[PDB]
Amino acid sequence: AAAQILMNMQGTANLMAIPQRLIFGAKPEELGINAETGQRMFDAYMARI
Amino acid sequence: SIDPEKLRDQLLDAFENKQNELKSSKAYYDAERRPDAIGLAVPLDMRKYLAHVGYPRTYVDAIAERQELEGFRIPSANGEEPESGGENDPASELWDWWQANNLDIEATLGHTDALIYGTAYITISMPDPEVDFDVDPEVPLIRVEPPTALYAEVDPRTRKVLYAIRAIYGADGNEIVSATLYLPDTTMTWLRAEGEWEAPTSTPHGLEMVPVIPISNRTRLSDLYGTSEISPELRSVTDAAAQILMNMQGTANLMAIPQRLIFGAKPEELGINAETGQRMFDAYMARILAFEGGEGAHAEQFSAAELRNFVDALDALDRKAASYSGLPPQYLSSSSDNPASAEAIKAAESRLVKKVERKNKIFGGAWEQAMRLAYKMVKGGDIPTEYYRMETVWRDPSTPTYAAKADAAAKLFANGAGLIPRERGWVDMGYTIVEREQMRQWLEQDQKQG
Amino acid sequence: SIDPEKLRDQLLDAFENKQNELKSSKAYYDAERRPDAIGLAVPLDMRKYLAHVGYPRTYVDAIAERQELEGFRIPSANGEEPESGGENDPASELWDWWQANNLDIEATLGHTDALIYGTAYITISMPDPEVDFDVDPEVPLIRVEPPTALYAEVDPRTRKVLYAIRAIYGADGNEIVSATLYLPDTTMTWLRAEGEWEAPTSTPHGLEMVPVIPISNRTRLSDLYGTSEISPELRSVTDAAAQILMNMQGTANLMAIPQRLIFGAKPEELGINAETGQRMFDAYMARILAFEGGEGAHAEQFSAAELRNFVDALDALDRKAASYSGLPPQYLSSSSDNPASAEAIKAAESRLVKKVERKNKIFGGAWEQAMRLAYKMVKGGDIPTEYYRMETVWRDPSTPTYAAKADAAAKLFANGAGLIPRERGWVDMGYTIVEREQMRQWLEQDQKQG
């Protein structure tokens, strides 16, 4: 029983212990997604609005 | 009979495949990049920032650190005297060879090799003054070899070694620079190896017995080769804790800060330079930003991640790692409380001290078996039967509590009138075999006075 | 046999190759800038503000400062001097040379470099009155040298040094000013290596051994050459802490305060100067700003980032650095549970104290051999066999607790009617071998007066 709880808890930290961030209404083309890859590079540093 | 040049190659291939198991245990005691430790949430360009964890090293140290040998006890000869002391007793003879070889250094290393890898090898050999020019030439050379250098076939029936090989590498390419075979009645060494072999430098010996004795970390009958002490439970808790550190560190680099956003604003109204996609916000405190209404615009932020939502999981894995190892709770920093009193200390390490008292017996068996062999080497004849009954004497592996030992022992002895003979009090105080053999003189030098 | 001019060039190449490794572990104890320490969330200019973390400095200091040698034991051929007579005995003979060379100063540093880089060397010489001064001409000149200035190759089979080179740089000139090559048959030195490379001064010596011996931090028999005490395990947490600390230090400049916004009127209607994009909000404390507020205007703010999200992660990493190093929990400031009891101190010290006793043994094994070489060099004959049985005596690394030992010792001795001889009372009370042999004189003065 404790083996199962430990394994779920460990897996949760790999997948689910982090908030997941969504944007609605935004057209992928207006956000400038590179359409053959599906990504664009968010430069993350400090307070960039 | 068996071909010794066949045995050379056959055992060398047996050893060289065996080393691959040992690398999987080395990789916990010193922190290599284990593949299972990588925290999966960290993005691929940050996966190089490895988190390392000290549980396996801490556990192997805390056991092998407490162990120390005081001396050898051989039971009394004809008429059964209390000790044969001062008259070159077999206890002081075996302890002389132990001192003269610095085995008080080489054993405390070699026991860690026996814990990490599950085995270590005691080689017993005649001095060769024409080859090693800085040892006492009267004393048998006893030296400890790690399982990354010596290998032995053990007979599963009698548990004697059948034969054993030793090999070593002399170059950065790790080509063998020499190899040595130990056989029931001889040893052979090839002075160069792995192609271009030299002639076998040879030596017969008087024994029926192969001159290598294995220390092995046994924990059951069967299991006879012994095991790493870094058990599968502690391995899995080490790897699980490493993963959670990587995801927690990679969280701090990405999500400890709330990501600020604006919706409904045309970037060209905000004055974004279209080439860079950027505008230089003026950053100083208490600036108020002004915006035009745009679409009917508004601001919003993604939250930070709560970093402590990993920390209140690591605070579980420390308590697991404590319970699966039996360290005192404070060694893995798993308590706000700490031992206030002598009895709280004696209770808190009650697991670890018995783990160590168990290891003292299991390695004691190998050190007796080594010294009985060293006697047959140097004294040449068959062994006198009291040696089959010898015992290693180890330190008390607990933390010393001298004030609570002293006002107990003094109260038992009560100036000779009390419950114990004088020199039982000396061994309750933990004075070693040598310390007690010395105090007979100082006591006599005080007994001259009045 | 071997070309000495060749061997000098060859060993300078081998010596420089070692510095490429040592530059990586130096950088943790000196806390130079490291690639892994930079806080990734901090912008490309603010990455100048490094955040050096002191765990390696702390952990090596807290070992190297506990260590102290206090004498030598040489178990005599049995007689009226079992260990000493008080003058003209082997124990005094070595302690004279230890004092005359100030090795109490030098070897305290030598252990530090040996823990940082993983090894350091003892070089033993006769003094030359044509070259060296302020040393007693009849004692052997003993120096300890770090691996940043000396390299020694080991025969892997015998585990003894084959040859070694001391390489001295011209300080800021970044060039070798002199080099000295030690052989089993001789030393040899090329007194200048800047401008023209000068001819060698040889000096023969009577030993079979080469006159250098390594101190090594060898934790385990498989570590055939010494290894740094600043383990990969502790390096990872040192660098991980620096990232968290630097991400906090960036956040405390940009993000610790809310950012205020207004979404209503156009800049010209807000009275903003159109050229500069600013107005002087005359913000003395009580004043109310008023706005015409067209098209359903509103004001709002992005939150401050909660800096305690990073503090929770620094507290977690401090609990880890305590657990890996085995320092007392107070030395990391990791928890406030100050051990306010005589026995609770022994508990909190227990793992650091015991670790230091193992470093004392492993370095004591080298300091024995340095004195065996020094005696063999000075007296010329092969050494009396009791020097192969020598033992270094080290000061107890536990914090004094003088009053707890004091009551205990007096309770045991009981004005001479007690359990132990007076002399053992002094040993357990922790006075050094020099204090013991000095204190005997005052006891004779007191008894002679009555």
mmCIF file with all atom_site columns, C-alpha atoms in Angstrom, chain B residues 164-235:
data_model
loop_
_atom_site.group_PDB
_atom_site.id
_atom_site.type_symbol
_atom_site.label_atom_id
_atom_site.label_alt_id
_atom_site.label_comp_id
_atom_site.label_asym_id
_atom_site.label_entity_id
_atom_site.label_seq_id
_atom_site.pdbx_PDB_ins_code
_atom_site.Cartn_x
_atom_site.Cartn_y
_atom_site.Cartn_z
_atom_site.occupancy
_atom_site.B_iso_or_equiv
_atom_site.pdbx_formal_charge
_atom_site.auth_seq_id
_atom_site.auth_comp_id
_atom_site.auth_asym_id
_atom_site.auth_atom_id
_atom_site.pdbx_PDB_model_num
ATOM 1  C CA . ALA B 1 164 ? 42.006 -15.941 -7.057  1.00 0.00 ? 164 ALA B CA 1
ATOM 2  C CA . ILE B 1 165 ? 43.514 -13.386 -9.464  1.00 0.00 ? 165 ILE B CA 1
ATOM 3  C CA . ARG B 1 166 ? 44.743 -9.822  -8.992  1.00 0.00 ? 166 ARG B CA 1
ATOM 4  C CA . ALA B 1 167 ? 45.245 -7.284  -11.797 1.00 0.00 ? 167 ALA B CA 1
ATOM 5  C CA . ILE B 1 168 ? 46.210 -3.592  -12.052 1.00 0.00 ? 168 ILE B CA 1
ATOM 6  C CA . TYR B 1 169 ? 46.440 -0.883  -14.760 1.00 0.00 ? 169 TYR B CA 1
ATOM 7  C CA . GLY B 1 170 ? 49.515 1.371   -15.308 1.00 0.00 ? 170 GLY B CA 1
ATOM 8  C CA . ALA B 1 171 ? 48.349 3.839   -17.991 1.00 0.00 ? 171 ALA B CA 1
ATOM 9  C CA . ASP B 1 172 ? 45.477 6.254   -18.805 1.00 0.00 ? 172 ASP B CA 1
ATOM 10 C CA . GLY B 1 173 ? 44.252 3.824   -21.527 1.00 0.00 ? 173 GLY B CA 1
ATOM 11 C CA . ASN B 1 174 ? 43.832 1.313   -18.637 1.00 0.00 ? 174 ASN B CA 1
ATOM 12 C CA . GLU B 1 175 ? 45.944 -1.454  -20.149 1.00 0.00 ? 175 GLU B CA 1
ATOM 13 C CA . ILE B 1 176 ? 46.950 -4.097  -17.511 1.00 0.00 ? 176 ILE B CA 1
ATOM 14 C CA . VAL B 1 177 ? 50.509 -3.398  -16.213 1.00 0.00 ? 177 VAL B CA 1
ATOM 15 C CA . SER B 1 178 ? 50.661 -6.685  -14.215 1.00 0.00 ? 178 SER B CA 1
ATOM 16 C CA . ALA B 1 179 ? 48.601 -9.650  -12.979 1.00 0.00 ? 179 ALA B CA 1
ATOM 17 C CA . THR B 1 180 ? 49.047 -12.215 -10.154 1.00 0.00 ? 180 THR B CA 1
ATOM 18 C CA . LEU B 1 181 ? 47.422 -15.636 -9.637  1.00 0.00 ? 181 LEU B CA 1
ATOM 19 C CA . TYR B 1 182 ? 46.968 -17.162 -6.151  1.00 0.00 ? 182 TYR B CA 1
ATOM 20 C CA . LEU B 1 183 ? 46.713 -20.968 -6.032  1.00 0.00 ? 183 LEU B CA 1
ATOM 21 C CA . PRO B 1 184 ? 46.312 -23.485 -3.148  1.00 0.00 ? 184 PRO B CA 1
ATOM 22 C CA . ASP B 1 185 ? 50.126 -24.081 -2.934  1.00 0.00 ? 185 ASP B CA 1
ATOM 23 C CA . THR B 1 186 ? 51.736 -21.206 -4.960  1.00 0.00 ? 186 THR B CA 1
ATOM 24 C CA . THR B 1 187 ? 51.535 -17.696 -6.400  1.00 0.00 ? 187 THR B CA 1
ATOM 25 C CA . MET B 1 188 ? 52.574 -16.593 -9.920  1.00 0.00 ? 188 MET B CA 1
ATOM 26 C CA . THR B 1 189 ? 53.031 -13.038 -11.303 1.00 0.00 ? 189 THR B CA 1
ATOM 27 C CA . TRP B 1 190 ? 53.413 -11.906 -14.908 1.00 0.00 ? 190 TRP B CA 1
ATOM 28 C CA . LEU B 1 191 ? 55.477 -8.677  -14.778 1.00 0.00 ? 191 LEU B CA 1
ATOM 29 C CA . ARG B 1 192 ? 53.737 -7.244  -17.915 1.00 0.00 ? 192 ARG B CA 1
ATOM 30 C CA . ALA B 1 193 ? 50.289 -8.134  -19.242 1.00 0.00 ? 193 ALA B CA 1
ATOM 31 C CA . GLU B 1 194 ? 47.443 -7.954  -21.820 1.00 0.00 ? 194 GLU B CA 1
ATOM 32 C CA . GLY B 1 195 ? 49.548 -8.958  -24.823 1.00 0.00 ? 195 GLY B CA 1
ATOM 33 C CA . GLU B 1 196 ? 53.398 -8.991  -24.574 1.00 0.00 ? 196 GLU B CA 1
ATOM 34 C CA . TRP B 1 197 ? 53.289 -11.027 -21.297 1.00 0.00 ? 197 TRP B CA 1
ATOM 35 C CA . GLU B 1 198 ? 56.496 -11.467 -19.266 1.00 0.00 ? 198 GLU B CA 1
ATOM 36 C CA . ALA B 1 199 ? 57.683 -14.772 -17.702 1.00 0.00 ? 199 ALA B CA 1
ATOM 37 C CA . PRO B 1 200 ? 55.827 -15.990 -14.525 1.00 0.00 ? 200 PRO B CA 1
ATOM 38 C CA . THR B 1 201 ? 57.767 -14.887 -11.416 1.00 0.00 ? 201 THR B CA 1
ATOM 39 C CA . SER B 1 202 ? 56.858 -17.827 -9.151  1.00 0.00 ? 202 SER B CA 1
ATOM 40 C CA . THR B 1 203 ? 56.700 -18.631 -5.394  1.00 0.00 ? 203 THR B CA 1
ATOM 41 C CA . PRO B 1 204 ? 55.531 -21.841 -3.624  1.00 0.00 ? 204 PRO B CA 1
ATOM 42 C CA . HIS B 1 205 ? 54.000 -21.634 -0.103  1.00 0.00 ? 205 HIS B CA 1
ATOM 43 C CA . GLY B 1 206 ? 53.475 -24.236 2.653   1.00 0.00 ? 206 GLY B CA 1
ATOM 44 C CA . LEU B 1 207 ? 49.669 -23.905 3.008   1.00 0.00 ? 207 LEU B CA 1
ATOM 45 C CA . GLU B 1 208 ? 46.903 -26.094 1.569   1.00 0.00 ? 208 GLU B CA 1
ATOM 46 C CA . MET B 1 209 ? 44.947 -22.812 1.503   1.00 0.00 ? 209 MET B CA 1
ATOM 47 C CA . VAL B 1 210 ? 44.782 -20.007 -1.080  1.00 0.00 ? 210 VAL B CA 1
ATOM 48 C CA . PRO B 1 211 ? 46.494 -16.992 0.656   1.00 0.00 ? 211 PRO B CA 1
ATOM 49 C CA . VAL B 1 212 ? 43.494 -14.626 0.250   1.00 0.00 ? 212 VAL B CA 1
ATOM 50 C CA . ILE B 1 213 ? 40.585 -14.306 2.703   1.00 0.00 ? 213 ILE B CA 1
ATOM 51 C CA . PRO B 1 214 ? 37.399 -12.428 1.634   1.00 0.00 ? 214 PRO B CA 1
ATOM 52 C CA . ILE B 1 215 ? 35.680 -9.900  3.859   1.00 0.00 ? 215 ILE B CA 1
ATOM 53 C CA . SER B 1 216 ? 32.077 -10.123 2.604   1.00 0.00 ? 216 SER B CA 1
ATOM 54 C CA . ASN B 1 217 ? 29.040 -8.098  3.677   1.00 0.00 ? 217 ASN B CA 1
ATOM 55 C CA . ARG B 1 218 ? 26.676 -11.098 4.265   1.00 0.00 ? 218 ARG B CA 1
ATOM 56 C CA . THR B 1 219 ? 23.193 -10.444 5.777   1.00 0.00 ? 219 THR B CA 1
ATOM 57 C CA . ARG B 1 220 ? 21.612 -13.954 5.450   1.00 0.00 ? 220 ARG B CA 1
ATOM 58 C CA . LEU B 1 221 ? 22.776 -17.512 4.894   1.00 0.00 ? 221 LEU B CA 1
ATOM 59 C CA . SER B 1 222 ? 22.802 -18.183 1.163   1.00 0.00 ? 222 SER B CA 1
ATOM 60 C CA . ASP B 1 223 ? 23.647 -14.736 -0.374  1.00 0.00 ? 223 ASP B CA 1
ATOM 61 C CA . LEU B 1 224 ? 27.185 -15.941 0.168   1.00 0.00 ? 224 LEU B CA 1
ATOM 62 C CA . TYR B 1 225 ? 29.110 -13.392 -1.947  1.00 0.00 ? 225 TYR B CA 1
ATOM 63 C CA . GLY B 1 226 ? 27.606 -10.574 0.182   1.00 0.00 ? 226 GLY B CA 1
ATOM 64 C CA . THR B 1 227 ? 25.872 -7.421  -1.055  1.00 0.00 ? 227 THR B CA 1
ATOM 65 C CA . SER B 1 228 ? 26.237 -3.688  -1.295  1.00 0.00 ? 228 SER B CA 1
ATOM 66 C CA . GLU B 1 229 ? 24.929 -2.071  1.902   1.00 0.00 ? 229 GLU B CA 1
ATOM 67 C CA . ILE B 1 230 ? 23.299 0.574   -0.388  1.00 0.00 ? 230 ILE B CA 1
ATOM 68 C CA . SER B 1 231 ? 20.081 -1.496  -0.522  1.00 0.00 ? 231 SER B CA 1
ATOM 69 C CA . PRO B 1 232 ? 17.415 -1.215  -3.308  1.00 0.00 ? 232 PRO B CA 1
ATOM 70 C CA . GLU B 1 233 ? 15.103 0.715   -0.942  1.00 0.00 ? 233 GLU B CA 1
ATOM 71 C CA . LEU B 1 234 ? 17.685 3.404   -0.163  1.00 0.00 ? 234 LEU B CA 1
ATOM 72 C CA . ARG B 1 235 ? 18.607 3.565   -3.878  1.00 0.00 ? 235 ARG B CA 1
#
